[PDB]
Chain length 352, copies 4
């Protein structure tokens, strides 16, 4: 079958593989729509997560179930499904510890294009269908729905880890797709002031749509200075790190109040370490909590985000700046993420 | 000074009182806008808090500071302020335990119209102004602002106690002012489906405005079955008990899932019994948590909710269906509250 | 195979039954040590969970794996294991919400002598072995280990739900086996003062051993007054409800401070409803949280408590007052539990 | 009065000052026992808090109340008290935010030998006696009580921030006084295995006394590998960084499980960067939470810790390896704290 894959670090191309087969609890799905992530880049051209050979890429898909194993009870061929980007093995200690994301090891809950073939093929394999698939209501358009497997769950998890109090001020550092869902997330947790950091025109516009009350552009002076200025030297209650480089940690620590919380949902691809600024961190005694986590996956997560979309609590369609048709265009869409132009938030490819 | 008081159970009337003077840490404040509450009614006519004599009523005001003590540092004569319904003593062990609402006694954080003269007076006394007042921005209309001291903080506390998860389903029982803020609060915590229970058309309209996706009334017999039917016998994640009788508790337990949470923000002042239905409560082992708490007060709570209004995360003006003008219409607004007309949610009296 | 079974409400006896076989993921186990529980007594003589027919009793066992299904990876014939009283289906939505106790339904995680034959049998069936068994270190004596599956997980979950702060004061109501692990559990959460309510001499000695600094007995059914006096009218921070009738709820609420927490680990099998004392619960506004939940089960829970025993953080053997040897003595053990002698805490049949 | 003071960076000596006088809410206290801290050392010799001139040193004392202001209700001349190292101003926004340690700014809760004269004087000033002192029971010996103001509150906060689960494994890095209270703290939160990293024999013996089940030292090479070996490649649930340089941060991140918690209770100064290793931190997505906080102070904290001492939940007397008599030996104890002999944990000076 056709599949667009990371041949080796630095090389990508269309390969051919055996169409996969489902174990008793598994499902085979064909993609209806897919999206590329900057994470696919951080790993192909930067090896942020080690080397690989011939690994079909991509982990954001809505699809149609084409086959299920004999033990699968809730899905059958023909069902339209949202496939979470994280599809954990649900029978592990990590799951008993309440961290399915790390079922089987650090980040191991994230399988597609981390440790198994991704969704950029004619077909793909989902482990444990009943636990890891969600039904797609026909109301919700494909392009919107494909923002759910990853962008929405990551962004919102940023808000969730931040433990936002009603009325509190939040800075979201980065306003790409993830940062934009970070903003929407923070609003849906009751944030008052939300300050987005970024400069892309399309992103600024979307940031305001999602609930940003202020936008800071690096071109107008340093972010910390700008935030301290906006908050009259008081800083903010919460910071969500969604995008940018490792220097954003230091920025987040300098902006946040003592006793506050920093929530990293930014996948850090380069550098050995991240510096925490000693003084601004109260030398380790400022109660400035640093959190950071891979997005939740599985059926329940998807079903919950789907509800939010269904009851119109969030509209992820504004995230999709580019739509193309057909397999051939997965490459185009992939490269668009590598050399991200000024008008890009998230590309989506719709299959026939 | 002039003041609308409770003379005794069942009796209210205009009386003459000594205008209060501030201690070193206090402020005297004159009302700019007040609103009478369901609680004042129950207090007067149903002996909800026991007998009182010549106690000035009302606990919901925005106002102007007219005098401050020698140690007050942040507020000064002429300042427009939101006055929280709850104005704790901040130097107690309850406060060190993190329960200012119960500083110096159960619910002792609530002073106005309880243990001290309330705000239906030419002036009133705010203890510890620096800790118990918030500056009110000019941008916010008085009628909106005066919903903050009680309705908004109470209703939102309900959503807070409920510990709503993103996408989870919520029932709010009672759709008066507090339940409406309960609905708005639940939406701001990221709730998917929000079921409101109540029947007054003005309230149902508002309930929908604030995020209710479904409305139900007992007018079809028994509420629990109706909820179970809406939810396919699954129940809901969270129940907020905002208005109604003590039977409400039993209904909430029955409606909510195992592991769920029920939160009460209704002062049960009648002698009706609070019953937990044994079976529906899994014999006390269903992890159906039961919470109930007097609304937060003090400066920080008010500042945070003011930000919610300011940045347009909530629009509480919908609660305000009647507006009167001039100190004397207090009595009219209070009477109006006593014989609840069908078009009434919340009346406000704006002072000249 | 031979089993000790509920024949019908009111009637027990030895029965012969087909030896169970394992599914792909299951294990068949033989008891090495077993203990009867009050729950066994009630199920049979008070119909507590409804009518059962030829259902093998008992849910507390240390055992040895005799056979495993083809997919079992971590356990094999000969492995000595601790078997949790709670053995959930791990592939359900409840598990995804973090409530394995209620996987597939309220309290559905409890299977032994409820929905399936319990452990008082020559063999018993354990669903999902890899998720529901824990290797037993040789260093731990059987009589100690057998307190883990229910007594220790339950008592400790009382202390857990109680969210105890360091140095805080705790009342444990009921000083039977479960209450005593509640006392031990509270000490292991950093509690300062621990007040045990009860009178039975062997239980009082044991309560002291596990951390109680004070013992009180009901005078003529009354207890709240004695606690207030102990604490100079301040009351206590936390109350764990471990034994006694529904009326201990009112007692817990009256003893606990505003903003405190009450945790129920006591099964209530009688009466339509539990009554909350309105006045003492601050008419629903005193932030006196009411929690209650079936003990955690599964592998990890057992492994954790095993470590507590192994590292000598708690010594459960003092719960064990009577030790019989031999399978046929299950009947004796059970009747000893039915006829609760004054010197009895828990009996243990050691087969081995 | 006489006082032992920081003259200037790198210089210390005895000076003469005016005896402090109480504001209305304040108390004047004479030391009955004092302890020098490692922070008085950095302050003096590393300028860790900036330039100071004639500032009396020390922030650990138990004393007797000599004088109270007119507003002090709960303490009177003659009263023996434990004085918290952290004595915040209780009327601030930060206190309303729940962070008294940062009342009025980052670490501003810590006043003694920071922004006001410390306890190494014939008298010292305590702001807000009623919120900031606790009565000291005769039962508790002076040398032991003096470990409460800072050592115990700090170690235990390490354990609190770490959110230890029952039976979880904990590594405490550093087994100086604070690390030792960290170990005891972890035991009191229900830790199973506790691994202490250190090498000084007296410290190793105290570590074992306080609950360490294993002891590792750097002089067996690199710490992480050893921990992974002890845990068979699994790592630990929790890490408390109580001592050592900043590279401890990277070791802690590397040894903790995905989803784990790291808590810092060590003051990082001088010149070692706080670095988070990217790979071991899962590129910021391994849910390895990093916390760090100044110890709680105030009356309630001290009262709770006094209770744990009173009820024999912990015996801090083991931290005191050196006791001297005489106000004058304050210098000797200080220098002893500077050049740190192999046999020193904590020294105490006992006054007449
Ligand atoms: Cl009683
Ligand atoms: Zn991604
Ligand atoms: Zn924090
Ligand atoms: Zn719950
Ligand atoms: Zn509470
Ligand atoms: Zn110190
Ligand atoms: Zn974590």
């Amino acid at each position: 079958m056709k599949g667009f894959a990371m041949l080796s670090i630095g090389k990508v191309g269309w390969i051919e593989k055996e169409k996969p087969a489902p174990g008793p609890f598994d499902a085979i799905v064909r993609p209806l729509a897919v999206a590329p992530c900057t994470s696919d880049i951080h790993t192909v051209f930067e090896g942020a997560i080690g080397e690989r050979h011939n690994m079909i890429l991509g982990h954001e898909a809505v699809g149609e179930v084409v086959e299920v194993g004999s033990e699968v009870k809730d899905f059958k061929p023909g069902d339209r499904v949202v496939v979470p980007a994280i599809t954990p093995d649900w029978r592990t200690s990590e799951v008993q510890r309440g961290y399915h994301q790390h079922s089987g090891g650090m980040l191991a809950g994230w399988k597609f294009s981390n440790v198994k073939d991704g969704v950029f093929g004619e077909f793909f394999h989902v482990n444990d269908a009943d636990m890891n698939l969600a039904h797609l209501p026909k109301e919700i358009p494909l392009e919107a729905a494909v923002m759910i497997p990853d962008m929405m769950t990551t962004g919102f998890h940023g808000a969730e880890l931040a433990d936002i109090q009603m009325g509190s001020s939040v800075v979201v550092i980065g306003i790409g797709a993830v940062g934009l869902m970070g903003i929407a997330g923070a609003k849906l947790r009751g944030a008052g002031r939300i300050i987005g950091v970024g400069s892309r025109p399309i992103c600024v516009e979307a940031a305001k749509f999602y609930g940003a009350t202020d936008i800071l552009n690096y071109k107008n002076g340093h972010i910390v200075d700008q935030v301290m200025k906006l908050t009259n030297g008081k800083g903010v209650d919460r910071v969500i790190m969604a995008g940018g480089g490792s220097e954003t940690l230091s920025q987040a620590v300098s902006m946040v109040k003592p006793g506050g919380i920093i929530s990293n949902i930014n996948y850090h691809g380069s550098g050995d370490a991240l510096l925490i600024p000693r003084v601004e961190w109260g030398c380790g005694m400022a109660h400035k909590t640093i959190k950071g986590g891979l997005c939740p996956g599985g059926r329940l997560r998807m079903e919950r985000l789907i509800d939010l979309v269904f009851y119109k609590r969030v509209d992820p369609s504004k995230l999709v700046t580019h739509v193309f048709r057909g397999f051939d265009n997965i490459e185009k869409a992939f490269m668009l993420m590598k050399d991200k132009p000024k008008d890009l938030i998230k590309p989506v490819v719709i299959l026939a």
